[PDB]
Design a protein around this ligand. Structure first.
Ligand SMILES: CCC(=O)SCCNC(=O)CCNC(=O)[C@H](O)C(C)(C)COP(=O)(O)OP(=O)(O)OC[C@H]1O[C@@H](n2cnc3c(N)ncnc32)[C@H](O)[C@@H]1OP(=O)(O)O
Ligand SMILES: *C(=O)CCCC[C@@H]1SC[C@@H]2NC(=O)N[C@@H]21
Lengths: 136, 64, 135, 210, 290, 69
C-alpha cells in the first residue's frame, strides 16, 4: 500500500469535477459505444493504470491500478471492440488475470457492459462453451 | 480535408470572406476531384495548403 | 456423494426474467464449489441452450447422445443474422461437433441406455469424493 | 485435350489454359452444357476459360468434375457451321490507319476492306467494355500486330482490328487497335432487349457502305 | 410510401446490391457492394433479403430526411457515428426513424465505406436486373445527388429480432491479407517479394482497383506480352512497371496483366475498407511452389 | 521541409530515381530493407530530385537525408 489520506465527509459531499464527468459519459443510445478507459482512469488513483495484454482480445481490458493506495485488478468490458461481447480470447485473458490477482490477494473490480457472447460457428467449433466456462 | 489527396485547386484568397456552400479547395483522390465546400459564412483565415501539395485526412484547411 | 445432472435444456424461462439468471449464477457457483470435491457428471439428452451449457462445462464428465442432443450458447438464427452462415442445430452443436471439433464431450453414446451404461462405468472407477479411495 | 492445365484463381474460381481460341470456345460450350452445380459465371478469353463459383466450398468438387467432361470433336471449328452470318454490320471505311501501318503488309486499302468485308468474322470472347466483342477467325492476312502504344478518344462506333482480332468500340474509350472504319450501329445499350448487339459464339460479317 | 430525400451526398454515395453476375458474355462486370459482408449484414439487420439494395457511402458525410412514414434503418461498415436528428446511434445496430427525422453520417474513424440499409430496401429502378452502379461503365442508378428522392420498397413479413451485431473493428493502418499464389507467379524473377514487402496504398485506389507501391516486382522476360484473360475481384495484377494492383468490384471482365495472386474470399472484403495511405502486408494462403 | 528522410534504420536495397528526374507526390524514391522486410520511401511533394546522397547497398541511420525537393 501507498500512503493516501482519505478525505472526510460523505460520498456525495466528496464528488470532484472529475467524478462529475462520469454523469455525462454514457451515450443516450444503448448501442453507441464508448471507451471504457474513460471509467477506469477516473476511478483509479492518479489515473494511473498498468494495462496487461493491451494488444490481445481488446474487447476486454484488464490491468492493475490503485484505489486509495490499495492495489486493485480491473477487469472491464470494452464496448469499442465486438460491442463488448465476450469471446474465447477475452474469456481466457480475463480468467488468467483474475486467477493471478486471486493468488496474490489483489481485490478485483469489474466494470460490466456486456451484451452477451460473440455469436458464430467459429466460436462454437473452437470451444466457447469449454473456454468461456474458464471465466466462470 | 475529408480524405487524403492532392490539392488540385485552392479557390479562395487569404482572409477572404466566404458564404456557406462556396468552394475552398479541390482534392484529387479516389481517382476523382472532390470539392471542399464552406459550411458557414465567415472569413477564410490562415489558408494552410498550397496547390499541388499532398495532404492527409483530417488536416485543417482553414478555420472558419 | 457424486452428482449426476441429466440436462435437457431450452435455457432461461424468458417470462420469469432476471431471477432465472440469478438461479443460473447460483447453480454455477455450486458447480465450482463442488469442482474437485465430488465427481460431477452431465448427461446431455436434448437441446441444452444458453445457460444450460455452462453447468455441463463445469462438471467433470459430459456424455452426449449422438443424433438427439445438442449444446450451443446462441441459436442458429442469431448466428445467421450476425454471421450470415446458415447452420442447423445438429451441425452447430450436435454430439459429433462437440466431440470431434469443440472437444467438450467425453462420450458419444449410441442411445440413452448406452449413455447410462457409460455413466455407470465411469462411476465404477470414481470414488464418492476426494477424501475417499477409488473402488 | 481432355482438360487443360487448371489453376486455382483464388479459392473461388478456376482457370483453364488452352492453346487456341477454338479450344476455348468449344470448351465454353461444353461447360455451358455441363451446367456444373455451383458455377456462377464462365468467362472465355484469348487463351483461357475462367470459371467463377458460388464459393470456396465448390472449388475442389468442381476441379474433380472437370476431369469427367469431354468436348465433342466436331465442335472445334474455324469456320461457321452453316457458313451463316448472324449479324451484318454496315461500315464506312474512313479508317485512320488502314493505309499507313497495315496496307504496307501487302494488301492495298481496297484489298484490305474487300477481304474484311468478304470474310466471315467470329464473335469471340468479350471484355474491355460492355458490348465490345473480340471478333476472331477472320482473314489471316489482316493480322497486323498491336500498335505497341495506347490510344485515346477512340470514337463510339469506331471499327478496328489488331492481332488476330477485329472489333467495334461501343463508346469513346482508350482502345489499342488500328482503325479501319466506322459504324453507326449501337453496339451497346442497356435499354435494348439484347443490350450487346454481339455476343460470344455468334458469327458476324461486315458489309461495306464506303 | 416512404422515401428518403438526399440532403447531402458526402464525397460519394452509390446504390449497391450483390450486383449483376453472369453477364460476362455481355462484358458487364458484376460490380455490387465493395464490402459484401457489410452490405449483407446491414440487410440482415433490417431483415431484408440480401439482394435488397443499400446506399454505399464513401468517407461518410451522407445525410437524408425520412419522409412519408416510419422506417427501420441500419448502418454498417465504417464507423461514422450515424445519428438521427444529431443523436448518435450505434453502427451495426438497427434504429427506427420516424417520419420527418434526419439521418446523418459523420466522417469514418477508420475504414472507408458505410452501408445504409432500410427495411424494404432502396427501391430505385434496376438496370440489367441489379440496382448496383458500376463506376467504370456507369451502368446502374446514377451516383446520388442532393435532392434525390429514394423510394423505400415494400418489406417482407419477417421482422428485425436483433438490436445489434458485434463486428471486429476495422484496422487503422496495417492490413494483413491471405493471398492464393499464382496462376502467373512464375512470370517473376522473385515473386516472394510480394509477401516480403510492406506495400503502401496510393491515392489512385478506387472501386476499379487499388494501386500499391513498394519493392518493384521484376519480370523474368520484360518484353513478354500476355494474352488477355478473365479477372475477378481481389486479383493482384502486376503491370510491367512492377507495382501491384488489386482489382476491386468494378474491375474489367478481362485483364491484360499477369495475376501474381488472388486474395482469399476470407479476406477480399477487407480490401473494401482500406483507405489510401494505409500499409498492406500479404502472406501466401498456402505454400507457393512451382 | 524539402528533405526526403529515411523513416527507419535500414539498407537501401533499391534507388528508384536519379537527380534531375521529375517526381510527383507519392512517387517512389527508395526502398529500405530492415528486419527482413522491405519498405518504400516516397516523394512528399512534386519537384525534381536534388541533393541525392544515398546509393544501393548503403546502410543508413534513421532520419538520414535521402534527397531534397
Ligand atoms: C440465458 C438463456 C437464454 O438467453 S435462452 C434464449 C433463447 N431460448 C430458447 O428458446 C432456447 C433456444 N431455442 C431453440 O433453439 C428451440 O426453440 C428450443 C427451445 C431449444 C427447443 O424448442 P422446440 O423443441 O423447437 O419447441 P418449440 O419451439 O415448439 O417450443 C415448445 C414450448 O417450449 C416453450 N419454450 C421453449 N423455450 C422456452 C424458453 N426459453 N422460455 C420459455 N418458454 C420456452 C415454448 O414457448 C413452447 O411452449 P408452447 O408449447 O408453445 O406453449
Ligand atoms: C486504375 O488505375 C485501375 C485500372 C484497372 C482497370 C484497367 S482497364 C485497362 C487495364 N487492363 C486491366 O486488366 N486493368 C486495367
Amino acid at each position: 500500500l501507498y500512503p493516501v489520506a482519505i478525505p472526510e465527509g460523505s460520498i456525495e459531499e466528496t464528488l470532484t469535477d472529475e467524478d462529475l464527468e462520469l454523469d455525462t459519459l454514457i451515450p443516450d443510445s444503448p448501442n453507441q459505444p464508448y471507451d471504457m478507459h474513460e471509467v477506469i482512469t477516473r476511478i483509479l488513483d492518479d489515473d494511473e493504470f498498468l494495462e496487461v495484454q493491451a494488444g490481445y482480445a481488446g474487447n476486454i481490458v484488464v490491468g492493475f491500478g490503485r484505489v486509495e493506495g490499495r492495489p486493485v485488478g480491473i477487469v472491464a468490458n470494452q464496448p469499442t471492440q465486438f460491442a463488448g461481447c465476450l469471446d474465447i480470447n477475452a474469456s481466457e485473458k480475463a480468467a488468467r488475470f483474475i486467477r493471478t490477482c486471486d493468488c496474490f490477494n489483489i481485490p478485483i473490480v469489474l466494470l460490466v457492459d456486456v451484451p452477451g457472447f460473440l455469436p458464430g460457428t467459429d466460436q462454437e467449433y473452437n470451444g466457447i462453451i469449454r473456454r468461456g466456462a474458464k471465466l466462470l | 480535408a475529408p480524405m487524403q489527396g492532392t490539392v488540385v485547386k485552392v479557390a479562395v484568397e487569404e482572409g477572404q470572406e466566404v458564404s456557406a456552400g462556396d468552394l475552398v479547395v479541390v482534392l484529387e483522390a479516389m481517382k476523382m476531384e472532390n470539392p471542399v465546400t464552406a459550411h458557414k459564412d465567415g472569413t477564410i483565415t490562415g489558408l494552410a495548403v498550397e496547390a499541388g501539395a499532398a495532404i492527409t485526412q483530417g488536416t485543417v484547411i482553414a478555420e472558419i | 456423494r457424486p452428482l449426476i445432472g441429466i440436462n435437457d435444456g431450452a435455457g432461461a424461462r424468458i417470462q420469469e426474467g432476471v431471477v432465472s439468471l440469478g438461479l443460473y449464477s447460483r447453480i454455477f457457483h455450486n458447480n465450482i464449489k463442488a469442482s474437485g470435491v465430488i465427481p460431477q457428471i452431465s448427461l446431455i439428452m436434448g437441446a441444452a441452450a444458453g445457460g444450460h451449457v455452462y453447468s455441463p462445462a463445469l462438471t467433470d464428465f459430459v456424455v452426449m447422445v449422438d443424433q438427439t442432443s445438442q449444446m450451443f450458447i446462441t441459436g442458429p438464427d442469431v448466428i445467421k443474422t450476425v454471421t450470415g452462415e446458415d447452420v442447423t442445430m445438429e451441425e452447430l452443436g450436435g454430439a459429433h461437433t462437440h466431440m470431434a471439433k469443440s472437444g467438450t464431450a467425453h462420450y458419444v453414446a449410441s442411445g440413452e441406455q448406452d449413455a447410462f451404461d457409460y455413466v455407470r462405468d465411469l462411476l465404477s472407477y470414481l470414488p464418492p469424493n476426494n477424501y475417499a479411495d477409488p473402488p | 485435350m481432355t482438360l487443360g492445365t487448371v489453376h486455382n484463381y483464388g479459392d473461388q474460381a478456376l482457370l483453364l489454359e488452352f492453346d487456341s481460341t477454338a479450344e476455348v470456345l468449344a470448351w465454353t460450350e461444353t461447360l455451358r452444357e455441363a451446367e456444373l452445380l455451383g458455377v456462377v459465371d464462365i468467362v472465355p478469353a484469348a487463351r483461357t476459360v475462367l470459371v467463377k463459383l458460388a464459393g470456396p466450398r465448390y472449388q475442389a468438387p468442381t476441379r474433380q468434375r472437370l476431369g469427367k467432361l469431354r468436348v465433342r470433336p466436331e465442335a472445334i471449328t474455324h469456320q461457321p457451321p452453316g457458313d451463316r452470318v448472324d449479324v451484318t454490320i454496315d461500315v464506312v471505311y474512313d479508317g485512320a490507319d488502314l493505309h499507313e501501318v497495315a496496307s504496307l503488309t501487302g494488301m492495298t486499302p481496297a484489298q484490305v476492306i474487300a477481304a474484311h468485308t468478304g470474310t466471315p468474322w467470329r464473335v469471340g470472347f468479350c471484355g474491355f467494355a460492355p458490348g465490345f466483342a473480340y471478333l476472331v477467325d477472320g482473314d489471316a492476312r489482316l493480322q497486323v500486330p498491336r500498335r505497341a502504344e495506347p490510344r485515346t478518344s477512340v470514337p463510339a462506333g469506331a471499327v478496328a482490328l489488331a492481332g488476330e482480332f477485329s472489333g467495334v468500340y461501343p463508346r469513346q474509350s482508350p482502345g489499342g487497335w488500328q482503325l479501319i472504319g466506322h459504324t453507326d450501329a449501337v453496339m451497346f445499350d442497356v435499354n435494348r432487349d439484347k443490350p450487346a448487339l454481339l455476343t460470344p459464339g455468334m458469327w458476324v460479317q461486315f458489309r461495306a457502305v464506303g | 410510401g416512404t422515401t428518403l430525400e438526399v440532403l447531402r451526398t458526402g464525397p460519394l454515395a452509390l446504390v449497391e446490391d450483390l450486383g449483376r453476375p453472369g453477364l460476362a458474355h455481355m462484358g458487364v462486370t458484376r460490380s455490387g457492394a465493395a464490402d459484401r459482408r457489410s452490405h449483407t449484414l446491414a440487410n440482415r439487420l433490417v431483415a431484408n433479403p440480401g439482394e435488397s439494395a443499400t446506399i454505399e457511402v464513401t468517407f461518410g458525410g451522407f445525410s437524408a430526411r425520412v419522409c412519408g412514414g416510419d422506417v427501420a434503418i441500419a448502418v454498417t461498415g465504417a464507423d461514422t457515428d450515424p445519428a438521427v436528428n444529431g443523436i448518435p446511434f450505434g453502427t451495426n445496430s438497427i434504429h427506427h426513424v420516424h417520419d420527418g427525422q434526419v439521418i446523418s453520417l459523420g466522417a469514418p474513424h477508420s475504414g472507408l465505406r458505410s452501408y445504409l440499409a432500410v427495411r424494404g430496401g432502396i427501391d430505385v429502378t434496376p438496370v440489367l436486373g441489379s440496382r448496383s452502379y458500376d463506376v467504370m461503365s456507369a451502368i446502374g442508378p446514377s451516383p446520388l445527388r442532393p435532392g434525390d428522392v429514394l423510394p423505400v420498397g415494400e418489406h417482407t413479413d419477417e421482422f428485425p429480432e436483433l438490436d445489434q451485431a458485434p463486428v471486429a473493428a476495422i484496422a487503422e493502418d496495417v492490413v494483413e491479407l491471405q493471398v492464393v499464389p499464382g496462376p502467373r507467379d512464375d512470370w517473376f524473377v522473385d515473386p516472394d517479394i510480394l509477401v516480403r514487402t510492406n506495400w503502401l496504398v496510393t491515392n489512385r485506389s478506387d472501386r476499379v482497383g487499388m494501386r500499391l507501391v513498394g519493392m518493384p516486382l521484376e519480370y523474368r522476360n520484360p518484353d513478354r506480352q500476355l494474352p488477355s484473360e478473365g479477372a475477378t475481384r481481389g486479383a493482384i495484377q502486376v503491370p510491367p512497371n512492377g507495382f501491384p494492383v488489386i482489382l476491386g468490384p468494378d474491375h474489367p471482365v478481362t485483364g491484360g496483366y499477369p495475376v501474381i495472386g488472388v486474395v482469399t474470399e476470407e479476406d477480399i472484403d477487407k480490401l473494401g475498407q482500406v483507405r489510401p495511405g494505409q500499409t498492406v502486408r500479404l502472406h501466401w494462403a498456402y505454400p507457393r511452389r512451382p
